[PDB]
Amino acid sequence: MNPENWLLLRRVVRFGDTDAAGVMHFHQLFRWCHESWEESLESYGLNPADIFPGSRKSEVTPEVALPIIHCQADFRRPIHTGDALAMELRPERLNPNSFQVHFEFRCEEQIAAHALIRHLAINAQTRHRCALPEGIDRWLEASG
Amino acid sequence: MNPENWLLLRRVVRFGDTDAAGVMHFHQLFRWCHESWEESLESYGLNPADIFPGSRKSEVTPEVALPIIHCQADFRRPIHTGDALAMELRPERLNPNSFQVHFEFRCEEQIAAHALIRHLAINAQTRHRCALPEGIDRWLEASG
Amino acid sequence: MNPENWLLLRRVVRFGDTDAAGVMHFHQLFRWCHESWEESLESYGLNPADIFPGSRKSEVTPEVALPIIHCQADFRRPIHTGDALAMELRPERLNPNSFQVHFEFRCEEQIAAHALIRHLAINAQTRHRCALPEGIDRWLEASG
Amino acid sequence: MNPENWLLLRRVVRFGDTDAAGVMHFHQLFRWCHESWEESLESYGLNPADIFPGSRKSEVTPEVALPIIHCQADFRRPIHTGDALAMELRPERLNPNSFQVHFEFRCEEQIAAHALIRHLAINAQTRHRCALPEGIDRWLEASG
């Protein structure tokens, strides 16, 4: 498996993602990032049922939560309804309990925006810091 | 307590609620309905912790889920950023296990949209139909 | 071109689409419908720039608006994060100035929800009723 | 007029703002920030019609766009459905063409999250940098 298969993703900007200024409403970018992260994990081969609560086939609710503790974005060029965006993800293990993902959005080969999302692994019930789930660790390693 | 206190509500249309057509994006109406229903329950005097999962002060997760089984809306006049909307709610008990709420949205005294949301009471763990929670029944009765 | 290519679509339910009840938050369904309608038009071969305002490559803003005048949905089975949903679209010309689209959502071959969205064609500047744009008429005809 | 009237704002976390982890879904924070900024401008006394496109009563579409070029947030404590959040806004003029707003969210007197949004003033048609609109400059000055 070539990592581009799960780190190079694509999406098309839809009409409801825009505001009356005629361009993407800013916070939608973060939704797109989160969804591309989920898509990446899926494409690498992880099962949603093992990572995300609310999943149909979980035998138990996943034990480790991955709350976002920081995120940011820079908006460089306007993004429009119907734009085909090329998304490149670059994950980084920060320590045994945390990781971040950088997201770069290109349209017609030019960078239109980029974002960074940082997660901490905690026990979902105690909220104490804990080790990253094994599947997330495999994905981080494979994506090096 | 006069029921208008919890059935007549107000909100202002915000920029992110609009699309590049220069008017409210259609599905936002439903979010506004749901939020006004929550506001109504709050204004009548019910505690979120007794009705909605995810609440900070629940001693246990609420036992009865109120899934939406049907909803609809008619859009009659365009709705714009910065519009002050007067919302009137009209709840109806349908049977011991179900209710619906009608929402009318006025701007400058004219009806711009209206919607209807129907809920069924089910046990959150078994998903069997069950009786409406007592607080919801009090609200329905008070709102007659 | 076989119409299934643009009327049979797929999407995966993402974590942000769910609420603390552990299932899809109801109004997201409508967003999914609208986005699948846009996807259908794209897949049939229409150019966003000719239909939707806010598009990058429009020579002029499209002259005909397609406001939603009515929509509704029935929710039959719970929908969960990571569910693969098979979406089937069935468009219907209603008259020379209007159409609706029916959306059926299946998961593991069973209908989980369905929705209906009705549009009116109006001149974007005058807001008078007008004929459907030619591309939308081609799509309706091809989808018969 | 005391600036707290437009810089100290309040909102209640609603059920649709949460995900299946049982807490606010991260990107909603940014929507809340943007809406509180709009609320602040309104509360200071500015007219939406002069600042935001899509407004009902604009004689012409506002000439100056205020695109967000950067934003970020830190999430410190979990935020739950029904939480009453105290929002404090701290605007800063950066130069004649730009400003940022810092947003602090408190619940039960403790900081749960904070965010920063930076805007650039551009001519809406040319997209060249330009001076801040006079009303935004009045608000910035009053909020010092």
Coordinates of C-alpha atoms in Angstrom, one line a residue:
Chain A
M1 CA 0.0 0.0 0.0
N2 CA 1.3 3.5 -1.2
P3 CA 0.4 6.2 1.5
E4 CA -0.8 8.6 -1.1
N5 CA -3.8 6.2 -1.3
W6 CA -4.9 7.5 2.1
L7 CA -3.1 10.9 2.4
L8 CA -4.1 12.4 -1.0
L9 CA -7.8 13.0 -1.0
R10 CA -10.3 15.0 -3.0
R11 CA -13.5 16.9 -2.5
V12 CA -15.8 19.2 -4.3
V13 CA -17.0 22.4 -2.7
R14 CA -20.9 22.4 -2.5
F15 CA -23.4 25.2 -2.6
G16 CA -24.3 25.0 1.1
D17 CA -20.7 25.4 2.1
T18 CA -20.7 29.1 0.7
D19 CA -22.0 32.3 2.2
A20 CA -23.5 35.4 0.7
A21 CA -20.0 36.8 0.1
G22 CA -20.0 34.2 -2.8
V23 CA -17.2 32.0 -1.3
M24 CA -16.7 29.2 1.3
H25 CA -17.7 30.1 4.8
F26 CA -14.5 29.9 6.8
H27 CA -15.4 27.3 9.4
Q28 CA -16.4 24.7 6.8
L29 CA -12.7 24.2 6.3
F30 CA -12.4 22.5 9.6
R31 CA -15.3 20.1 9.0
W32 CA -13.6 19.2 5.7
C33 CA -10.4 18.5 7.6
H34 CA -12.0 16.3 10.2
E35 CA -13.9 14.4 7.5
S36 CA -10.7 13.9 5.5
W37 CA -9.0 12.5 8.6
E38 CA -11.8 10.0 9.0
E39 CA -11.5 9.2 5.3
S40 CA -7.8 8.6 5.6
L41 CA -8.2 6.2 8.5
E42 CA -10.9 4.3 6.5
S43 CA -8.6 4.2 3.4
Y44 CA -5.7 2.9 5.4
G45 CA -8.0 0.2 6.5
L46 CA -9.1 1.0 10.1
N47 CA -12.7 0.2 11.2
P48 CA -14.8 3.2 12.5
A49 CA -16.3 0.9 15.1
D50 CA -12.9 0.7 16.8
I51 CA -12.3 4.4 17.0
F52 CA -15.4 6.5 16.9
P53 CA -18.3 6.4 19.2
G54 CA -21.8 6.2 17.6
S55 CA -20.8 3.5 15.2
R56 CA -23.2 0.8 14.2
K57 CA -20.9 -2.3 14.8
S58 CA -19.0 -1.5 18.0
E59 CA -19.0 -4.3 20.5
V60 CA -18.3 -1.7 23.1
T61 CA -17.9 2.0 22.9
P62 CA -14.3 2.8 22.1
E63 CA -12.3 3.2 25.3
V64 CA -9.9 6.1 24.1
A65 CA -11.3 9.5 23.2
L66 CA -9.2 11.7 20.8
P67 CA -10.3 15.3 21.7
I68 CA -9.1 18.2 19.7
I69 CA -7.1 20.5 21.9
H70 CA -6.0 23.0 19.3
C71 CA -6.7 23.8 15.7
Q72 CA -5.9 26.6 13.3
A73 CA -6.1 27.6 9.7
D74 CA -4.7 30.1 7.2
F75 CA -7.0 31.1 4.2
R76 CA -4.9 32.2 1.3
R77 CA -7.2 32.2 -1.8
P78 CA -10.9 32.3 -2.2
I79 CA -12.7 28.9 -2.5
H80 CA -15.8 28.6 -4.6
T81 CA -18.8 26.4 -5.1
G82 CA -17.9 23.5 -7.5
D83 CA -14.1 23.9 -6.9
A84 CA -12.3 20.5 -7.0
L85 CA -9.9 20.6 -4.0
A86 CA -6.9 18.3 -3.7
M87 CA -6.3 17.6 0.0
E88 CA -2.9 16.5 1.2
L89 CA -2.6 15.2 4.8
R90 CA 0.6 15.1 6.8
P91 CA 0.2 13.5 10.2
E92 CA 2.8 13.8 13.0
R93 CA 3.1 11.8 16.2
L94 CA 3.9 14.3 18.9
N95 CA 4.4 11.9 21.8
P96 CA 2.9 8.6 22.9
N97 CA -0.3 10.4 23.8
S98 CA -0.8 12.9 21.1
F99 CA -0.7 13.7 17.4
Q100 CA -1.5 16.4 14.9
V101 CA -2.5 16.5 11.3
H102 CA -1.7 19.2 8.8
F103 CA -4.1 19.6 5.9
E104 CA -3.2 21.5 2.6
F105 CA -6.0 22.4 0.2
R106 CA -5.0 23.0 -3.4
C107 CA -7.2 24.2 -6.3
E108 CA -5.8 24.4 -9.8
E109 CA -2.4 23.5 -8.3
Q110 CA -2.3 26.5 -6.0
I111 CA -2.6 26.4 -2.2
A112 CA -5.9 28.0 -1.2
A113 CA -5.8 27.2 2.5
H114 CA -4.1 25.0 5.1
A115 CA -5.0 23.9 8.6
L116 CA -3.6 22.0 11.6
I117 CA -5.6 19.9 14.1
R118 CA -4.0 18.6 17.3
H119 CA -5.4 15.7 19.3
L120 CA -4.8 14.3 22.8
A121 CA -5.6 10.7 23.7
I122 CA -7.6 10.3 26.9
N123 CA -9.5 7.5 28.5
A124 CA -13.1 8.3 27.6
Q125 CA -14.4 7.6 31.1
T126 CA -11.7 9.0 33.3
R127 CA -10.4 11.7 30.9
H128 CA -6.8 10.9 32.0
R129 CA -4.2 11.1 29.3
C130 CA -3.4 7.7 27.9
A131 CA -1.6 6.0 25.0
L132 CA -2.8 6.4 21.4
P133 CA -5.0 3.6 20.2
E134 CA -3.0 0.9 18.4
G135 CA -4.8 1.5 15.0
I136 CA -4.0 5.3 15.2
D137 CA -0.4 4.4 16.0
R138 CA -0.3 2.1 12.9
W139 CA -1.7 4.8 10.7
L140 CA 0.8 7.4 12.1
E141 CA 3.7 5.0 11.5
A142 CA 2.5 4.0 7.9
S143 CA 2.1 7.7 7.1
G144 CA 5.7 8.6 8.1
Chain B
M1 CA -46.7 31.8 33.8
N2 CA -48.1 33.0 30.4
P3 CA -47.3 30.4 27.6
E4 CA -46.2 33.2 25.2
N5 CA -43.1 33.4 27.5
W6 CA -42.0 30.0 26.1
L7 CA -43.9 29.7 22.8
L8 CA -43.0 33.1 21.3
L9 CA -39.3 33.3 20.7
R10 CA -37.0 35.4 18.6
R11 CA -33.8 35.0 16.6
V12 CA -31.6 37.0 14.2
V13 CA -30.4 35.4 11.0
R14 CA -26.6 35.3 10.9
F15 CA -24.2 35.6 8.0
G16 CA -23.1 31.9 8.1
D17 CA -26.7 30.9 7.8
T18 CA -26.8 32.3 4.2
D19 CA -25.6 30.9 0.9
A20 CA -24.2 32.5 -2.3
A21 CA -27.8 33.0 -3.5
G22 CA -27.8 35.8 -0.8
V23 CA -30.5 34.2 1.4
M24 CA -30.9 31.6 4.2
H25 CA -29.7 28.2 3.1
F26 CA -32.8 26.0 3.4
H27 CA -31.9 23.4 5.9
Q28 CA -30.9 25.9 8.5
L29 CA -34.5 26.4 9.2
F30 CA -34.7 23.0 10.8
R31 CA -31.8 23.7 13.1
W32 CA -33.5 26.9 14.2
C33 CA -36.7 24.9 14.9
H34 CA -34.9 22.3 17.0
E35 CA -33.0 25.0 18.9
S36 CA -36.2 26.9 19.6
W37 CA -37.9 23.8 20.9
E38 CA -34.9 23.4 23.3
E39 CA -35.3 27.1 24.2
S40 CA -39.0 26.6 24.9
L41 CA -38.4 23.7 27.2
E42 CA -35.8 25.7 29.1
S43 CA -38.1 28.8 29.3
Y44 CA -41.0 26.7 30.6
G45 CA -38.5 25.5 33.3
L46 CA -37.3 22.0 32.3
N47 CA -33.7 21.0 33.0
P48 CA -31.6 19.9 30.0
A49 CA -30.0 17.2 32.2
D50 CA -33.4 15.4 32.4
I51 CA -34.1 15.3 28.7
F52 CA -31.0 15.5 26.5
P53 CA -28.0 13.2 26.5
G54 CA -24.6 15.0 26.6
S55 CA -25.6 17.3 29.4
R56 CA -23.2 18.3 32.1
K57 CA -25.3 17.6 35.2
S58 CA -27.2 14.4 34.4
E59 CA -27.0 11.8 37.2
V60 CA -27.8 9.2 34.6
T61 CA -28.2 9.5 30.9
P62 CA -31.9 10.2 30.2
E63 CA -33.8 7.0 29.8
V64 CA -36.3 8.1 27.0
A65 CA -35.1 9.2 23.5
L66 CA -37.3 11.5 21.4
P67 CA -36.2 10.8 17.8
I68 CA -37.6 12.8 15.0
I69 CA -39.6 10.5 12.7
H70 CA -40.9 13.2 10.3
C71 CA -40.3 16.8 9.5
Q72 CA -41.2 19.2 6.8
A73 CA -41.1 22.9 5.9
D74 CA -42.7 25.4 3.4
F75 CA -40.5 28.4 2.4
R76 CA -42.7 31.3 1.4
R77 CA -40.6 34.4 1.5
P78 CA -36.8 34.9 1.3
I79 CA -35.0 35.2 4.6
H80 CA -31.9 37.4 4.8
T81 CA -28.8 38.0 7.0
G82 CA -29.7 40.3 9.9
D83 CA -33.5 39.6 9.7
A84 CA -35.2 39.5 13.1
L85 CA -37.5 36.5 13.1
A86 CA -40.5 36.1 15.4
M87 CA -41.0 32.4 16.0
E88 CA -44.2 31.0 17.2
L89 CA -44.4 27.4 18.4
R90 CA -47.5 25.3 18.6
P91 CA -47.0 21.9 20.2
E92 CA -49.6 19.0 19.9
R93 CA -49.7 15.8 21.8
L94 CA -50.5 13.1 19.2
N95 CA -50.8 10.2 21.6
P96 CA -49.2 9.0 24.9
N97 CA -46.0 8.2 23.0
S98 CA -45.7 11.0 20.4
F99 CA -46.0 14.8 19.8
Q100 CA -45.3 17.3 17.1
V101 CA -44.4 21.0 17.1
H102 CA -45.4 23.5 14.4
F103 CA -43.0 26.5 14.0
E104 CA -44.1 29.7 12.2
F105 CA -41.4 32.3 11.3
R106 CA -42.4 35.9 10.7
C107 CA -40.4 38.8 9.6
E108 CA -41.9 42.3 9.5
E109 CA -45.2 40.6 10.5
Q110 CA -45.4 38.4 7.4
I111 CA -45.0 34.6 7.4
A112 CA -41.7 33.7 5.7
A113 CA -41.6 30.0 6.5
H114 CA -43.2 27.3 8.6
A115 CA -42.2 23.8 9.6
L116 CA -43.4 20.8 11.5
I117 CA -41.3 18.3 13.5
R118 CA -42.8 15.0 14.8
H119 CA -41.2 13.0 17.6
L120 CA -41.7 9.5 19.0
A121 CA -40.8 8.5 22.5
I122 CA -38.7 5.4 22.7
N123 CA -36.6 3.7 25.5
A124 CA -33.1 4.8 24.7
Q125 CA -31.6 1.3 25.2
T126 CA -34.4 -1.0 23.8
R127 CA -35.7 1.4 21.2
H128 CA -39.3 0.2 22.0
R129 CA -42.0 2.8 22.0
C130 CA -42.7 4.2 25.5
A131 CA -44.6 7.0 27.3
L132 CA -43.5 10.6 26.9
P133 CA -41.2 11.8 29.7
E134 CA -43.2 13.6 32.5
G135 CA -41.5 17.0 31.8
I136 CA -42.4 16.9 28.2
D137 CA -46.0 15.9 29.1
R138 CA -46.1 19.0 31.5
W139 CA -44.9 21.3 28.8
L140 CA -47.4 19.9 26.2
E141 CA -50.2 20.3 28.8
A142 CA -49.1 23.9 29.7
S143 CA -48.9 24.8 26.1
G144 CA -52.4 23.8 25.2
Chain C
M1 CA -24.8 7.0 -20.5
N2 CA -26.8 4.9 -18.0
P3 CA -28.8 7.1 -15.5
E4 CA -27.7 5.0 -12.6
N5 CA -24.3 6.7 -13.1
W6 CA -25.8 9.9 -11.8
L7 CA -28.9 8.7 -9.8
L8 CA -27.2 6.1 -7.7
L9 CA -24.8 7.7 -5.4
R10 CA -22.9 6.8 -2.2
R11 CA -21.8 8.5 1.0
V12 CA -20.3 7.6 4.3
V13 CA -21.8 9.1 7.6
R14 CA -19.0 11.1 9.4
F15 CA -18.5 11.7 13.1
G16 CA -19.6 15.4 13.0
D17 CA -22.9 14.4 11.5
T18 CA -23.9 12.7 14.7
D19 CA -25.3 14.0 18.0
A20 CA -24.9 12.9 21.6
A21 CA -27.8 10.5 21.1
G22 CA -25.2 8.5 19.2
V23 CA -26.9 8.8 15.7
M24 CA -27.2 11.2 12.8
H25 CA -28.6 14.6 13.7
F26 CA -31.9 14.9 11.8
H27 CA -31.3 17.9 9.7
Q28 CA -28.0 16.6 8.2
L29 CA -30.2 14.4 6.0
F30 CA -31.2 17.5 4.0
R31 CA -27.7 18.7 3.5
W32 CA -26.9 15.2 2.1
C33 CA -29.8 15.5 -0.2
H34 CA -28.8 18.8 -1.6
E35 CA -25.2 17.7 -2.0
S36 CA -26.3 14.6 -3.8
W37 CA -28.5 16.6 -6.2
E38 CA -25.4 18.8 -7.0
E39 CA -23.3 15.5 -7.4
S40 CA -26.0 14.2 -9.8
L41 CA -26.0 17.3 -12.0
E42 CA -22.1 17.1 -12.1
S43 CA -22.2 13.4 -12.9
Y44 CA -24.7 13.9 -15.7
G45 CA -22.3 16.5 -17.1
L46 CA -23.6 20.0 -16.2
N47 CA -21.2 22.8 -15.2
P48 CA -21.7 24.3 -11.7
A49 CA -20.8 27.7 -13.3
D50 CA -24.1 27.6 -15.3
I51 CA -26.4 26.8 -12.4
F52 CA -25.0 27.9 -9.0
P53 CA -24.0 31.3 -7.9
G54 CA -20.6 31.6 -6.2
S55 CA -18.9 29.5 -8.8
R56 CA -15.3 30.3 -9.9
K57 CA -15.8 30.2 -13.7
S58 CA -19.2 31.9 -14.3
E59 CA -19.0 34.5 -17.0
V60 CA -22.1 36.0 -15.4
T61 CA -24.0 35.0 -12.3
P62 CA -26.7 32.4 -13.3
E63 CA -29.9 34.1 -14.3
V64 CA -32.4 31.6 -12.9
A65 CA -32.6 30.8 -9.2
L66 CA -34.0 27.4 -8.0
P67 CA -35.3 28.1 -4.5
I68 CA -36.6 25.3 -2.4
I69 CA -40.2 25.9 -1.6
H70 CA -41.0 22.7 0.3
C71 CA -39.1 19.8 1.7
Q72 CA -39.8 16.8 4.0
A73 CA -38.3 13.7 5.3
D74 CA -39.3 10.4 7.1
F75 CA -36.7 8.8 9.4
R76 CA -37.3 5.1 9.6
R77 CA -34.0 3.5 11.0
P78 CA -31.2 5.0 13.0
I79 CA -28.1 6.1 11.0
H80 CA -24.7 5.8 12.5
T81 CA -21.2 7.2 12.1
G82 CA -19.3 5.2 9.5
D83 CA -22.5 3.8 7.8
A84 CA -22.1 3.5 4.0
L85 CA -25.4 4.9 2.6
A86 CA -26.6 4.0 -0.9
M87 CA -28.6 7.1 -2.2
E88 CA -31.1 6.7 -5.0
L89 CA -32.5 9.9 -6.6
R90 CA -35.8 10.1 -8.5
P91 CA -36.4 13.5 -10.1
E92 CA -39.8 14.6 -11.4
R93 CA -40.7 17.6 -13.6
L94 CA -43.8 19.0 -12.1
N95 CA -44.4 21.7 -14.7
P96 CA -42.3 24.0 -17.0
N97 CA -41.3 26.0 -13.9
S98 CA -40.8 23.4 -11.2
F99 CA -39.4 20.0 -10.2
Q100 CA -38.9 17.8 -7.2
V101 CA -36.4 15.2 -6.2
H102 CA -37.1 12.2 -4.0
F103 CA -34.1 10.7 -2.2
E104 CA -34.0 7.2 -0.7
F105 CA -31.2 6.3 1.8
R106 CA -30.4 2.6 2.2
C107 CA -27.9 1.0 4.6
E108 CA -27.3 -2.8 4.5
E109 CA -30.1 -2.9 1.8
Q110 CA -32.8 -1.5 4.1
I111 CA -34.4 2.0 3.8
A112 CA -33.2 4.1 6.7
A113 CA -34.7 7.4 5.5
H114 CA -36.3 9.2 2.6
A115 CA -36.8 12.8 1.7
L116 CA -38.4 15.1 -0.9
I117 CA -37.2 18.5 -2.0
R118 CA -39.3 20.8 -4.3
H119 CA -37.9 23.7 -6.3
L120 CA -39.3 26.6 -8.2
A121 CA -37.5 28.3 -11.1
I122 CA -37.5 32.1 -10.7
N123 CA -35.6 34.9 -12.3
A124 CA -32.9 35.7 -9.8
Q125 CA -33.3 39.4 -10.1
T126 CA -37.1 39.8 -10.5
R127 CA -38.1 36.7 -8.5
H128 CA -40.9 36.1 -11.1
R129 CA -41.5 32.5 -12.0
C130 CA -39.7 31.4 -15.1
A131 CA -38.9 28.4 -17.2
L132 CA -36.4 25.8 -15.9
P133 CA -32.8 26.3 -17.1
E134 CA -32.1 24.2 -20.2
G135 CA -29.5 22.0 -18.4
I136 CA -31.9 21.2 -15.6
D137 CA -34.5 20.3 -18.2
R138 CA -31.9 18.0 -20.0
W139 CA -31.1 16.3 -16.7
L140 CA -34.9 15.8 -15.8
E141 CA -35.5 14.4 -19.3
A142 CA -32.5 12.0 -19.1
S143 CA -33.5 10.9 -15.7
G144 CA -37.0 9.8 -16.7
Chain D
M1 CA -22.8 53.2 26.5
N2 CA -20.6 50.7 28.6
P3 CA -18.6 48.3 26.2
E4 CA -19.5 45.3 28.3
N5 CA -23.0 45.8 26.7
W6 CA -21.5 44.6 23.4
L7 CA -18.4 42.6 24.4
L8 CA -19.9 40.4 27.1
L9 CA -22.3 38.1 25.5
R10 CA -24.0 34.8 26.4
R11 CA -25.2 31.6 24.7
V12 CA -26.5 28.2 25.5
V13 CA -25.0 25.1 24.0
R14 CA -27.7 23.2 22.0
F15 CA -28.2 19.5 21.3
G16 CA -27.2 19.7 17.6
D17 CA -23.9 21.3 18.5
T18 CA -22.7 18.0 20.2
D19 CA -21.4 14.8 18.7
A20 CA -21.6 11.2 19.7
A21 CA -18.6 11.8 22.1
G22 CA -21.2 13.6 24.3
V23 CA -19.6 17.1 24.0
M24 CA -19.5 20.1 21.6
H25 CA -18.1 19.2 18.2
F26 CA -15.0 21.3 17.8
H27 CA -15.7 23.4 14.8
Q28 CA -18.9 24.8 16.2
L29 CA -16.8 27.0 18.4
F30 CA -15.9 29.1 15.3
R31 CA -19.5 29.5 14.3
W32 CA -20.2 30.8 17.8
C33 CA -17.4 33.2 17.5
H34 CA -18.5 34.6 14.2
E35 CA -22.1 34.9 15.4
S36 CA -21.0 36.7 18.6
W37 CA -18.9 39.1 16.5
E38 CA -22.1 39.9 14.5
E39 CA -24.0 40.2 17.8
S40 CA -21.4 42.6 19.1
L41 CA -21.6 44.9 16.1
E42 CA -25.4 44.9 16.3
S43 CA -25.3 45.6 20.1
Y44 CA -22.9 48.5 19.6
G45 CA -25.4 49.9 17.1
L46 CA -24.2 49.1 13.5
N47 CA -26.6 48.1 10.8
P48 CA -26.1 44.7 9.1
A49 CA -27.1 46.2 5.8
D50 CA -23.9 48.4 5.9
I51 CA -21.5 45.5 6.6
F52 CA -22.8 42.1 5.4
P53 CA -23.8 41.0 2.0
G54 CA -27.2 39.2 1.8
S55 CA -29.0 41.7 4.0
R56 CA -32.5 42.7 3.3
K57 CA -32.2 46.6 3.5
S58 CA -28.9 47.2 1.7
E59 CA -29.2 50.0 -0.9
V60 CA -26.1 48.6 -2.5
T61 CA -24.1 45.5 -1.6
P62 CA -21.4 46.6 0.9
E63 CA -18.2 47.7 -0.9
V64 CA -15.7 46.3 1.6
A65 CA -15.3 42.5 2.3
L66 CA -13.8 41.4 5.6
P67 CA -12.4 37.9 4.8
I68 CA -11.0 35.8 7.6
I69 CA -7.3 35.1 6.8
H70 CA -6.4 33.2 10.0
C71 CA -8.2 31.6 12.9
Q72 CA -7.3 29.3 15.8
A73 CA -8.7 27.9 19.0
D74 CA -7.6 26.1 22.1
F75 CA -10.1 23.7 23.8
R76 CA -9.4 23.4 27.5
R77 CA -12.5 21.9 29.1
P78 CA -15.3 19.9 27.7
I79 CA -18.5 21.8 26.7
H80 CA -21.9 20.1 27.1
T81 CA -25.4 20.5 25.8
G82 CA -27.3 23.0 27.9
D83 CA -24.1 24.8 29.2
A84 CA -24.6 28.5 29.6
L85 CA -21.4 30.1 28.2
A86 CA -20.2 33.6 29.0
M87 CA -18.4 35.0 26.0
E88 CA -15.9 37.8 26.3
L89 CA -14.7 39.5 23.1
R90 CA -11.5 41.5 22.9
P91 CA -11.0 43.2 19.5
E92 CA -7.7 44.6 18.3
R93 CA -7.0 46.9 15.4
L94 CA -3.8 45.5 13.8
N95 CA -3.4 48.2 11.1
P96 CA -5.6 50.5 9.0
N97 CA -6.6 47.4 6.9
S98 CA -7.0 44.6 9.5
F99 CA -8.2 43.6 12.9
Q100 CA -8.6 40.5 15.0
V101 CA -11.0 39.4 17.7
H102 CA -10.2 37.2 20.7
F103 CA -13.0 35.2 22.2
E104 CA -13.0 33.7 25.6
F105 CA -15.7 31.1 26.6
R106 CA -16.4 30.5 30.3
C107 CA -18.7 28.0 31.9
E108 CA -19.2 28.1 35.7
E109 CA -16.5 30.8 35.8
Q110 CA -13.8 28.6 34.3
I111 CA -12.3 29.1 30.8
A112 CA -13.4 26.2 28.6
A113 CA -12.0 27.4 25.3
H114 CA -10.7 30.5 23.6
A115 CA -10.3 31.5 19.9
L116 CA -8.8 34.2 17.7
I117 CA -10.1 35.3 14.3
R118 CA -8.2 37.7 12.0
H119 CA -9.7 39.7 9.2
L120 CA -8.4 41.7 6.3
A121 CA -10.4 44.5 4.7
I122 CA -10.5 44.2 0.9
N123 CA -12.5 45.9 -1.8
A124 CA -15.2 43.3 -2.6
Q125 CA -14.9 43.6 -6.4
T126 CA -11.1 44.1 -6.8
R127 CA -10.0 42.1 -3.8
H128 CA -7.3 44.8 -3.2
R129 CA -6.5 45.6 0.4
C130 CA -8.4 48.7 1.6
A131 CA -9.2 50.7 4.7
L132 CA -11.5 49.2 7.3
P133 CA -15.2 50.4 7.0
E134 CA -15.9 53.4 9.1
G135 CA -18.4 51.5 11.3
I136 CA -15.9 48.7 12.1
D137 CA -13.4 51.4 12.9
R138 CA -15.9 53.0 15.3
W139 CA -16.5 49.7 17.0
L140 CA -12.8 49.0 17.3
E141 CA -12.2 52.4 18.8
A142 CA -15.2 52.1 21.3
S143 CA -14.0 48.7 22.3
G144 CA -10.5 49.8 23.3

